[PDB]
Symmetry: C2
Subunit: 394 residues, 2 copies
């Protein structure tokens, strides 16, 4: 006779980044589930979608029917397949998985097939102001035990702009593209080939530029080259895959089956990068991991700062239960996040270790969460402009 009684959205920013967490309560005393709905740049719109529409959709329903709730909820507004819509669904979906694990007395990874590895290998970012900082940051991370690192340019000369400039964060894609191989030549000379390197193109250059970059980086044996094209340009990956053998990852921006499915169907990528909440939670991410598995494509779920610890846990339960796990991107959490969210995964020398508590093994202290209210506002970095002032995909 188990029923959903309450659905609320908790907005909190313990790490200085707006988060959304869905709590589903039931008619069984002390039984609730948590899920992540973090699309940080539209957090208030996500809250609106959950509070106004998902809440009346769910109250009175049997929470054990995860798939039925997903399939019906996904179409409940007719229109669908978007980042705000998918996050609203994810909050619910992950919470239901959390409830199912609690009822079963097992971690979500055990519901999904049990452990497929002994730890979850991580990669971290090495963001620096210039090349020497980046290199030292890599060395510091390798000392901490990281065996996979993202390497970017520091935060040839850029082109001169026109005589007036429309405000934005200016970037020179051609200067960038011509400079990346030099960076990796230097890093491989200094650090060797044992360490795994990731580089994120992050949709910043024209497609043929990305393809040429992929070819020029083959000799440096990257673990992957990430987002060489925008999702609007996935139709360029066929050409890239006729020419380059640099491993490719795509997908943190994906919100639609018609973005990832042609890529995985045609083996045009080697790693899938979706932000789990932004494709709708554990239910659809699990199916995607499986679809990827049968095509020899591996998982690399998005692991930035703009994911709640509930979402971090969701990534990692998928990770532990997938034979085709590739890598887990990881952004270190501060003490406030660990305090607000007891049960954060244990980070030890480049590997993550999940506790073996039931469901997602994570909780939220609502009183503590309330101490860190959301900021809102609009990010500056998404107003990217090329030297002539053209608004570009960031």
């Amino acid at each position: 006779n188990l029923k959903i009684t309450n659905v609320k959205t908790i907005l909190t920013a313990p790490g200085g980044i707006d988060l959304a967490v869905v709590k589903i309560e039931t008619n069984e005393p002390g039984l609730y589930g948590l899920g992540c709905a973090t699309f940080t740049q539209r957090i208030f719109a996500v809250k609106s979608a959950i509070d106004e529409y998902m809440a009346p959709f769910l109250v009175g329903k049997d929470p054990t029917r995860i798939e039925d709730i997903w399939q019906s909820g996904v179409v409940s507004g007719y229109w669908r397949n978007g980042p705000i819509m998918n996050n609203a669904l994810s909050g619910v979906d992950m919470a239901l998985w959390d409830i199912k694990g609690k009822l079963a007395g097992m971690p979500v990874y055990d519901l999904l097939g049990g452990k497929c590895r002994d730890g979850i290998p991580l990669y971290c970012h090495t963001d620096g102001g210039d090349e020497v900082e980046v290199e030292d940051n890599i060395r510091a991370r390798m000392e901490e035990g990281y065996q996979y690192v993202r390497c970017q340019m520091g935060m040839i000369q850029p082109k001169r702009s026109p005589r007036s400039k429309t405000p934005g964060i200016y970037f020179d894609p051609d200067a960038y593209a011509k400079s990346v191989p030099r960076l990796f030549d230097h890093l491989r000379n200094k650090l060797g080939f044992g360490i795994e390197f990731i580089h994120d193109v992050h949709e910043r250059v024209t497609p043929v530029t990305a393809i040429n970059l992929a070819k020029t980086l083959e000799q440096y044996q990257l673990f992957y080259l990430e987002d060489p094209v925008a999702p609007e340009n996935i139709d360029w990956l066929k050409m890239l895959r006729q020419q380059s053998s640099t491993p490719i990852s795509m997908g943190e921006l994906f919100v639609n089956v018609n973005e990832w499915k042609p890529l995985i169907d045609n083996r045009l990528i080697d790693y899938i990068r979706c932000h789990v909440s932004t494709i709708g939670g554990i239910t659809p991410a699990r199916k995607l991991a499986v679809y990827s598995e049968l095509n020899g494509v591996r998982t690399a779920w998005h692991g930035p700062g703009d994911i709640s610890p509930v979402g971090v846990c969701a990534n990692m339960h998928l990770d532990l239960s997938s034979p085709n796990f590739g890598i887990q991107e990881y952004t270190p959490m501060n003490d406030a996040l660990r305090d607000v969210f007891p049960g954060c995964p244990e980070i030890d020398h480049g590997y993550a270790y999940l506790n073996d508590k039931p469901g997602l093994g994570i909780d939220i202290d609502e009183a503590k969460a309330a101490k860190y209210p959301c900021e809102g506002g609009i990010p500056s970095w998404t107003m990217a402009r090329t030297p002539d002032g053209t608004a570009s995909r960031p």
Copy 2:
């Protein structure tokens, strides 16, 4: 600290058909899991594979690691992807899912995402000696509540005369057959109308272009599906079929290899997948296939003949209840002995199956009762199929 302590193969034939059921015991008293390993025609070789090789692979391992056991077990002999190999894995895989469900206090369908429908629609066979017997069988099954039926010729155009001597076999005329099917369906639609859903199984009996022409001729009769229009060895003909016909197609009870179903589902060349769950290696792979099918809009139609244990029957149905893209469940009525040996058989009520809500697969086996029906072995006569000139044909 849960461990597998014993793996055994129970061989029993309460329905007069050889079955293999794996029982996996643990170091927790009373906790065990059951799985189907029924490839009936090779049952003793399935037992040999499990007892000699799977049992020592598993003893002492943590049974909660289903996927790790599947992934390591599938490659434990290096060579893989076959009906005997896959059935040995399925016995184990299904038993482990049973164990996981028992441990969780929940049916396997609930582990897999919960109920996606309120009952499982079935189809049954209407096997008859001639056309009127088949038509009466359809009426009888419609009276019982079946809303979907398989319709075949009686077990017309005269068959071809054979050469002056004949090599023994079960003779069949594929051209007489193919020219007669549309007439059968014209008659059945004239008498019974279009509300009843019809399935027809080609069962790999004709050349591919014959099957393509037959699919086209049967369009007007609106079949729920036309089944196995080609052999697995001829799946490269389905592209041409799908350029021309819109009759829904099912394929796959013979499949044992990812390279059989994957190009078909990748290119949407079928509408239903028909694999025998144990024969592709269990719930673990069948679930993956159901999901791969879902994203391609392909629906499930797991094989449900007599040569499947009640444990396999339940495994099909736990998959069925938890798949959004469930299509249909073929169902073969069971006898008293099967029900007696295997307590927990699903409720069959007016064309729907209703699983009990017990943990695991909700099925058990009585080993003392099972021992009363020893397996027979031997060779089926029907698989020695020959065309009129005596050519050995795919049955």
